């Protein structure tokens, strides 16, 4: 169990590791939406952890990772500025930005197709009305609280 909870790297948001399983913990934030299986894990910005509550709208909760209604699992998070962020700056974390519609609960998608903001085929090449859907984060240690990356490991019973 511990070998899945905490490791040396984490997956980006649009491709969240649906990792399988088959005297409190020293993590400051802890909240359960059921009683006091599949464990997922990814990295999201500090202020945007709230959207991973059961049933809320936003930018990540409905376009990248969506919990179901009447949720039957807990959520965990803890600040991870030190390990992730660096003075040089890292850019290997992506989140989907332009998507046609919402996401069904516990649905994920991996794809790189240009979003057609208007009415133009674009021949698959980015242009005025065609955009790349995935845009990356930017991390640096000397940022305000909320912009720092947070590691999230949701438990779904």
């Amino acid at each position: 169990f511990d070998e899945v909870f905490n490791a040396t790297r984490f997956a980006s948001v649009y491709a969240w590791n649906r990792k399988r399983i088959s005297n409190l913990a020293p993590f400051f934030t802890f909240k359960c939406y059921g009683v006091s299986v599949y464990a997922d894990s990814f990295v999201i910005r500090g202020d945007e952890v709230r959207q991973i509550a059961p049933g809320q709208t936003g930018n990540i909760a409905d376009y990248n990772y969506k919990l179901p209604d009447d949720f039957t699992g807990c959520v965990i998070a803890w600040n991870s500025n030190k390990l992730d962020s660096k003075v040089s700056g890292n850019y290997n974390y992506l989140y989907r930005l332009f998507r046609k519609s919402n996401l069904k609960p516990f649905e994920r998608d991996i794809s790189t197709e240009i979003y057609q903001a208007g009415n133009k085929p674009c021949n698959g090449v980015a242009g005025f009305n065609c955009y790349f859907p995935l845009r990356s984060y930017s991390f640096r240690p000397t940022y305000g609280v909320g912009h720092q990356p947070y590691r999230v490991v949701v438990l779904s019973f």
Partner: single-chain antibody
Amino acid sequence: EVQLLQSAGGLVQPGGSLRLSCAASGFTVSANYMSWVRQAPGKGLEWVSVIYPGGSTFYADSVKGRFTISRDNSKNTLYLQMNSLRVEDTAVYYCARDLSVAGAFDIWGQGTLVTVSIVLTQSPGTLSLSPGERATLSCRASQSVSSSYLAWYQQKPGQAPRLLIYGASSRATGIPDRFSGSGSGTDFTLTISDFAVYYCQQYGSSPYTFGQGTKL
């Protein structure tokens, strides 16, 4: 051609209410982000609403509730309905799309007024310079957000504002080479080599914010 054409107006009493309509051509309004920017006389711009594709709605705290933003897929327009308009709510309302990373309010409507019965600062102030020399405009933020967020605007007297640079380093399309902006961290500097009021924009937070602006 692509443009936002807006049709509304009037002078309604504190009890009353009216409807604001904005129509778009060249792109389906049910595809990209849409918002509504409000400018009051003598004050900088302010954010009022965002609609995402998929129907999620967001509102400013000052106008939390009491408004409603609805889009009509069939007619390819954008609708805003104001209910229970208070006193001292008069201002010109702008219709503008949103890209938020590749662009910041790329194309704007002509702007129509409705009449009723992270804080940024602008260091340069009302800086006046003779023609033929370079000018430096400095914008200072609070939380020291990432370098790829702030964008700069130009607004001639009584017209829709336009964007110059969206990523603080990449000029917009159809922009002369004489405009350049730089700076990372807590300060952002833009320089020229056309008199207007130049604003600082920043996304990355729920409420957004605009600078007070400077008079050239």
